[PDB]
Design an enzyme around this catalytic site. Structure first.
Site, PDB file in Angstrom:
ATOM      1  N   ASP A   1       2.139  -4.855   1.431  1.00  0.00           N
ATOM      2  CA  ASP A   1       3.327  -5.598   1.841  1.00  0.00           C
ATOM      3  C   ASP A   1       3.538  -6.731   0.849  1.00  0.00           C
ATOM      4  O   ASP A   1       2.739  -7.671   0.799  1.00  0.00           O
ATOM      5  CB  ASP A   1       3.187  -6.137   3.258  1.00  0.00           C
ATOM      6  CG  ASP A   1       4.158  -7.260   3.545  1.00  0.00           C
ATOM      7  OD1 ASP A   1       5.378  -6.998   3.560  1.00  0.00           O
ATOM      8  OD2 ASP A   1       3.703  -8.405   3.744  1.00  0.00           O
TER       9      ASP A   1
ATOM     10  N   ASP B   1      -5.051  -4.336   3.924  1.00  0.00           N
ATOM     11  CA  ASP B   1      -4.848  -5.673   3.384  1.00  0.00           C
ATOM     12  C   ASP B   1      -5.341  -6.700   4.395  1.00  0.00           C
ATOM     13  O   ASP B   1      -5.134  -6.542   5.602  1.00  0.00           O
ATOM     14  CB  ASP B   1      -3.371  -5.909   3.061  1.00  0.00           C
ATOM     15  CG  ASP B   1      -3.170  -6.928   1.961  1.00  0.00           C
ATOM     16  OD1 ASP B   1      -3.978  -7.874   1.865  1.00  0.00           O
ATOM     17  OD2 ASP B   1      -2.200  -6.782   1.188  1.00  0.00           O
TER      18      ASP B   1
ATOM     19  N   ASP C   1       4.607  -4.724  -4.434  1.00  0.00           N
ATOM     20  CA  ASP C   1       3.859  -3.602  -3.887  1.00  0.00           C
ATOM     21  C   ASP C   1       4.671  -2.315  -3.845  1.00  0.00           C
ATOM     22  O   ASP C   1       4.380  -1.438  -3.026  1.00  0.00           O
ATOM     23  CB  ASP C   1       3.348  -3.942  -2.486  1.00  0.00           C
ATOM     24  CG  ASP C   1       1.889  -4.357  -2.481  1.00  0.00           C
ATOM     25  OD1 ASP C   1       1.032  -3.524  -2.840  1.00  0.00           O
ATOM     26  OD2 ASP C   1       1.600  -5.515  -2.114  1.00  0.00           O
TER      27      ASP C   1
END
Ligand SMILES: CCCCC/C=C/C/C=C/C/C=C/C/C=C/CCCC(=O)O[C@@H](COC(=O)CCCCCCCCCCCCCCCCC)COP(=O)(O)O[C@@H]1[C@H](O)[C@H](O)[C@@H](OP(=O)(O)O)[C@H](OP(=O)(O)O)[C@H]1O
Ligand SMILES: *[C@@H]1O[C@H](CO)[C@@H](O)[C@H](O)[C@H]1NC(C)=O
Ligand SMILES: *[C@@H]1O[C@H](CO)[C@@H](O)[C@H](O)[C@H]1NC(C)=O
Ligand SMILES: *[C@@H]1O[C@H](CO)[C@@H](O)[C@H](O)[C@H]1NC(C)=O
Ligand SMILES: *[C@@H]1O[C@H](CO)[C@@H](O)[C@H](O)[C@H]1NC(C)=O
Ligand SMILES: *[C@@H]1O[C@H](CO)[C@@H](O)[C@H](O)[C@H]1NC(C)=O
Ligand SMILES: *[C@@H]1O[C@H](CO)[C@@H](O)[C@H](O)[C@H]1NC(C)=O
Lengths: 942, 214
Positions: free
Chosen positions: A674, A353, A678
């Site tokens: 996160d 991410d 999720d």
């Protein structure tokens, strides 16, 4: 108290109940002997008192087992029981010295049981220490004495005022006083996944174990510990180990067969020589000596069995973990589920991410387009136009949230602290850099003037405010991502401080001049606009799509977060180690690719797809509206960057990759999501990392491993340990197998050529102890080296014993066998110390067998060092000092061996030796290392 | 003087036939009190009775029973009358040291304990060139002690060139003779130095290989 029945509102019942009992929430607050929302005295005696009588600690003991039950369980081995009964029979039958053998066997069995119990207790203690630290890590924000502070979850007591933010996990049952938009899912208790919106007037009940979805506020805890509605349910309530246990049972079967063969051979030889060759009838006077010979043969067989079968081999891996986890935390890898400690070693794909991991999560401005002038550097206020700073600073101060304040640096000569929204803090930092302060404006700017505030929502994609200060007019200030608000604005304020004509004709030129260079540089664009609404009889502010039109753009600000200095090298190392890293983010594709090209995920001159979420979903759903594996099988292999991706898209990508059969080797992935949504995506993957510094508790709850520093490099560290474990087990296995071969041979043919074995019961029990328990504690706990990332990930169908290990085992076994046989058959001549061969029953210990036992133990001790290298490394002494346990164990075993040979002769069937004999034994031991160095030159491929 | 008629002397062979020793008090004018057997001056157990004529029955003859038996006669007011019956067999060596390991400059001893009658005479010899040669006192370091059943040979100030070898004790008597052997080895003072040099050489070659590898 009555608080237990006060829960389970489920509607509008408990509100009328509290009305009947005390009236309102403040009433129970005062009765609670608890300070209201302003604060709490926080004095230690009062909090501890209300923790004992008025509350309950969160301390489930789980009652770990003690040493006594551990040794009791360890004593339950069948082979040890057989040895015990054989020793008892031999001891009692001595009278119808000799009791020495029985006493020694009993004592050695007791000592072995005690050592095994102690080892198990120590390992369990290590695991409990890890669990204690994992419990300690938790923390929740509360307020005490008017100060917001973070405390361990175990400390919260009834009456504490807790502050609730989106994504938090409620630890205790409490009452809602104040807040905004508090919507929480209570599916863990009611089974319904609908976001219940709590209000003081309709549902002030907050239950532990539920996940807060949107909104914020404060609560007063009423029920804690087992008194909660989530504790009632509790109260009324790998890959490697399979191969290890399979190998263990195979070796056990082989050892059993060998022991049976040895016993029958001994019995047949004895009876044939005594009765057939020598003409002796079945005399009843010499029955006891015959049965004593039989019991001696049986004891030899039982000892051969007790050494041949490997016990505790499948328990080896656990031991490694018990001595690795406590050190893994030094690399900021805090692990919750141990099953993922080794699975991450096999991981082949990592989905990352953008924010938090690759960026520093700090906003720094470099370039800005103001006054129709582009500025690659921050411009001074001297070169600027008229009225633009005063209006711009006023708009930034008014439009931005007031609660977010940039704290003074106070970091001992370091960067200032950033609090609140990242982008907003960046704009405020830019304003402060321009030698302007928004505090004087904000202090004199009351909240009543802002009648309308449109907070940033996903649908609107902008955040703005309106003020009615001007006479017969209103002024609105808007901020957007420079794409949504660009369509709204219809005039250009940058001409001479005055509005100009903005048209679709020059829309192309402005977007080419502004958006493209910042996007290429990797900068998200924020645009600020303002307008003067006329004083219409009734403006329609509800339809913000149409009323919020025809704006004037003050300027355009490009803001970005620096990429960490460690991620490039870590990504290069991961790509070298056969692990491919993909990137999933919600930002626009342009900035995503700009960041990825710098991070090294995607090469400049290569055909790597960078499609966004829309095209991804369209491609996988070109059918009647469903997702199929086959279409994903052509997209996932060459998908690097994903943009504008909802979390469900990440879940779909992980699911498609993990179960694909497109490639020959099954994929194992690691996702580091996160967020509050999720959950399924993180849970589906094999091992799911979470963020520690800035991460929602819902994400942490479902994650196998958390990173306490958020850095990407920490993930790399995990991989290292995930491989090291495997290697450790490997090397340990090697050593043990070697011993297990030689012993068996040295007791089989020894019982075939002669009527006895060179090693007695107690000596062979000591050899078993040193070969299993001390070997596991010494070889299976080694520090990893950075060279573990230079080999491709191991497959699922890999044989447990590699070719190099087999070569090492066979070579060292051959050397040991030839030397021991030479000492046994010819060693009478070399030392001139007579011969212990064909010794009669109850013969005194002879030096000829003591030399054999001592040289065998010395060869094992000096071969243990040679077994630390698996990949044929010649430098056996490389990095030996980094592990004190290995050196301590080897030296302690050597000292105990010297003591055992020199003293304690008769019980251990040893005789004192002189310096000459010991010197030759050590000479042979070092010759073992020389042969181990020699064998490494043999090419295993041929 | 009382008259005692005793059975004839017996020689113990390997035959399994038990032996009886007889003695009769043919003439005695005194009031007898008791009578009892002795072997080598030692009272045999459970042998005291009236027994104006006494019979001693040995069921399993071996060399370790052969001895100078007497049947002593104790009277109320007369001196005891002993007499003698001798039982003899070939001597049998019962215990000896199978090896003797001593460092040079110390003291060595070797013994050959045996049983039999007549008490044999002991001769010590050395096995040289495949034959047995009588030992020579020479420097006077050899101390040979002989007794009724026990013999020993002691050597002082052990050398390295003559002392190591094989020594035999030969134990001969009228009925037969019996000999056994013992091996004597003397250890060098500077023996431990050689394996230490071997360890040093191995360390040298190992470190050379390791440093060349780097
Ligand atoms: C040597 O050179 O060390 C020996 C250990 O010595 C003793 O431990 C024996 C104890 C005393 C016996 C005597 C002498 C190897 O031990 P192993 O040969 O017994 O273990 C194999 C091996 O693990 C293969 O990898 C497995 O699989 P595969 O052959 O296919 O590759 C195979 O399983 P399987 O063939 O049934 O499928 C196992 O049995
Ligand atoms: C045995 O008894 C007889 C008859 O009384 C007696 O003359 C003789 O002295 C006794 N001998 C002993 C007691 O030794
Ligand atoms: C010797 O004594 C025994 C036992 O009384 C007797 O039978 C035997 O005749 C005696 N012999 C002589 C010669 O007197
Ligand atoms: C009996 O007396 C005689 C006296 O000459 C003596 O020689 C003999 O040894 C004595 N027997 C015992 C057994 O003492
Ligand atoms: C050897 O000679 C020495 C000289 O003192 C003496 O002590 C020793 O007894 C002699 N005898 C034998 C049998 O060796
Ligand atoms: C040698 O004879 C003596 C006599 O006193 C005796 O004590 C000793 O045990 C005998 N040794 C034997 C028979 O081996
Ligand atoms: C002992 O020595 C004599 C005289 O040399 C000899 O005849 C005899 O065979 C020797 N043997 C034994 C077994 O003692």
């Amino acid at each position: 108290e009555e608080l237990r029945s006060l829960m389970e509102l489920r509607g509008t019942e408990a509100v009328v109940k509290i009305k009947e009992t005390y009236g309102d929430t403040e009433a129970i607050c005062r009765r609670l002997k608890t300070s209201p929302v302003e604060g709490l005295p926080g004095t230690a005696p009062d909090l501890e008192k209300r923790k004992q009588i008025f509350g309950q600690n969160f301390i489930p003991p789980k009652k770990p087992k003690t040493f006594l039950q551990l040794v009791w369980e360890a004593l339950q081995d069948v082979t040890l029981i057989i040895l015990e009964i054989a020793a008892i029979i031999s001891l009692g039958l001595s009278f119808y010295a000799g009791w020495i053998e029985g006493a020694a066997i009993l004592l050695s069995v007791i000592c072995v049981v005690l050592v095994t119990a102690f080892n198990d207790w120590s390992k369990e203690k290590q695991f409990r220490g890890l669990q204690s630290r994992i419990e300690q890590e938790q923390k929740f924000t509360v307020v005490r004495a008017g100060q917001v502070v973070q405390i361990p979850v175990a400390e919260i007591v009834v009456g504490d005022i807790a502050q609730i933010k989106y994504g938090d996990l409620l630890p205790a049952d409490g009452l809602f006083i104040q807040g905004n938009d508090l919507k929480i899912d209570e599916s863990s208790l009611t089974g319904e996944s609908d976001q219940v919106r709590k209000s003081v007037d309709k549902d002030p009940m907050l239950l532990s174990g539920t996940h807060v979805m949107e909104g914020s506020g404060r609560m007063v805890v009423t029920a804690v510990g087992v008194n909660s509605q989530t504790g009632i349910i509790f109260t009324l309530l790998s890959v490697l180990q399979g191969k290890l246990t399979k190998l263990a049972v195979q070796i056990g079967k082989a050892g059993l067969v060998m022991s049976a063969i040895t016993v029958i051979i001994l019995v047949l030889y004895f009876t044939v020589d005594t009765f057939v060759v020598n003409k002796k009838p079945w005399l009843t006077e010499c029955t006891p000596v015959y049965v004593q010979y039989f019991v001696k043969f049986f004891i030899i067989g039982v000892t051969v069995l007790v050494v041949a079968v490997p016990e505790g081999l499948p328990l080896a891996v656990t031991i490694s973990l018990a001595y690795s986890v406590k050190k893994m935390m030094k690399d900021n890898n805090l692990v919750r589920h141990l099953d993922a400690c080794e699975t991450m070693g096999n991981a082949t794909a990592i989905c990352s991410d953008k924010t938090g991991t690759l960026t520093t999560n700090r906003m720094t401005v470099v370039q800005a387009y103001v006054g129709d002038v582009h500025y690659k550097e921050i411009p001074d206020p001297s070169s600027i136009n008229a009225k633009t700073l005063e209006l711009l600073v006023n708009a930034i101060a008014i439009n931005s949230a007031y609660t977010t304040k940039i704290l003074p640096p106070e970091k001992e000569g370091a960067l200032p602290r950033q609090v609140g929204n990242k982008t907003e803090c960046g704009l405020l930092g830019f304003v402060l850099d321009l030698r302007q302060d928004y505090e004087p404006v904000r202090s004199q700017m009351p909240e009543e003037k802002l009648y309308k505030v449109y907070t940033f929502n996903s649908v609107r994609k902008s955040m703005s405010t309106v003020i009615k200060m001007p006479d017969e007019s209103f002024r609105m200030y808007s901020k957007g991502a420079s794409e949504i608000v660009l369509k709204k604005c219809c005039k250009i304020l940058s001409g001479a401080g005055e509005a100009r004509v903005f048209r679709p004709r020059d829309r192309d030129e402005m977007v080419k001049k502004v958006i493209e260079p910042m996007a290429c540089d990797g900068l998200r664009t924020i645009c600020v606009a303002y307008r003067d609404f006329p004083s219409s009889p009734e403006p329609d502010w509800d339809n913000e799509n149409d009323i919020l039109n025809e704006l004037t753009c003050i300027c355009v600000v490009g803001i970005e977060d620096p990429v960490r200095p460690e991620v490039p090298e870590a990504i290069r190392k991961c790509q070298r180690a056969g692990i491919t890293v993909r990137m999933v983010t919600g930002d626009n594709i342009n900035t995503a690719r700009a960041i990825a090209i710098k991070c090294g995920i995607i090469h400049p001159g290569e055909d790597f797809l960078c499609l966004e979420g829309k095209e991804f979903n369209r491609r996988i759903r070109n059918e009647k509206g469903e997702i199929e594996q086959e279409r994903i099988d052509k997209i996932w292999p060459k998908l690097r960057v994903l943009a504008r991706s909802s979390p469900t898209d990440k879940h779909t990508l992980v699911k498609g990759i993990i179960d694909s059969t497109h490639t020959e080797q099954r994929q194992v992935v690691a996702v580091t999501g996160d967020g509050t949504n999720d959950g399924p995506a993180l849970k589906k993957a094999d091992v799911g990392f979470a963020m520690g510094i800035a991460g929602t508790d819902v994400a942490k709850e479902a994650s196998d491993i958390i990173l306490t520093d958020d850095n990407f490099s920490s993930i790399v560290k995990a991989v290292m340990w995930g491989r090291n474990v495997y290697d450790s087990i490997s090397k340990f296995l090697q050593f043990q197998l070697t011993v297990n071969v030689v012993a068996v041979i040295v007791a089989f043919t020894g019982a075939c050529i002669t009527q006895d074995s060179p090693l007695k019961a107690v000596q062979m029990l000591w050899v078993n102890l040193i070969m299993d328990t001390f070997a596991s504690l010494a070889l299976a706990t080694e520090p990893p080296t950075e060279t573990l990332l230079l080999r491709k990930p191991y497959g699922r169908n890999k044989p447990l014993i590699s070719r190099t290990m087999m070569k090492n085992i066979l070579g060292h076994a051959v050397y040991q066998l030839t030397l021991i046989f030479t000492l046994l058959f010819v060693g009478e001549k070399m030392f001139q110390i007579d011969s212990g061969r064909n010794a009669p029953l109850h013969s005194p210990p002879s030096e000829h067998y003591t030399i054999i036992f001592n040289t065998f133990v010395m060869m094992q001790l000096f071969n243990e060092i040679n077994a630390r290298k698996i990949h044929g490394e010649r430098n056996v002494f490389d990095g030996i000092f980094r592990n004190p346990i290995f050196c301590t164990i080897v030296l302690g075993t050597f000292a105990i061996q010297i003591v055992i040979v020199q003293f304690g002769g008769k019980p251990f069937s040893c005789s004192p030796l002189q310096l000459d004999q010991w010197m030759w034994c050590i000479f042979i031991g070092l010759g073992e290392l020389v042969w181990g160095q020699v064998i490494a030159t043999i090419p295993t491929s041929r | 003087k009382p008259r005692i008629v005793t059975s004839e002397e017996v020689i113990i062979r390997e035959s399994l036939l038990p032996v009886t020793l007889q003695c009769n008090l043919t003439s005695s004018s005194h009031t007898l009190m008791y009578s009892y057997w002795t072997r080598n001056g030692v009272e045999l157990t459970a042998t005291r009775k009236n027994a104006s004529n006494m019979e001693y029955r040995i069921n399993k003859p071996r060399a370790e029973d052969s001895g100078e038996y007497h049947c002593v006669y104790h009277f109320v007011s007369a001196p005891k009358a002993n007499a003698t019956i001798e039982v003899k067999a070939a001597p049998d060596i019962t215990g000896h040291k199978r090896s003797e390991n001593k460092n040079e400059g110390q003291d060595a001893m070797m013994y050959c304990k045996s049983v039999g009658y007549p008490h044999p005479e002991w001769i010590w010899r050395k096995k040289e060139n495949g034959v047995f040669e009588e030992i020579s006192n020479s420097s006077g370091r050899f101390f040979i002690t002989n007794k009724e059943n026990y013999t020993e040979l002691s050597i002082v100030n052990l050398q390295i060139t003559e002392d190591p070898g094989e020594y035999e004790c030969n134990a001969t008597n009228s009925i037969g003779s019996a000999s056994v052997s013992t091996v004597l080895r003397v250890r060098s003072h500077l023996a431990p130095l050689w394996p230490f040099l071997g360890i040093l050489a191995e360390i040298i070659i190992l470190v050379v290989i390791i440093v060349v590898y780097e």
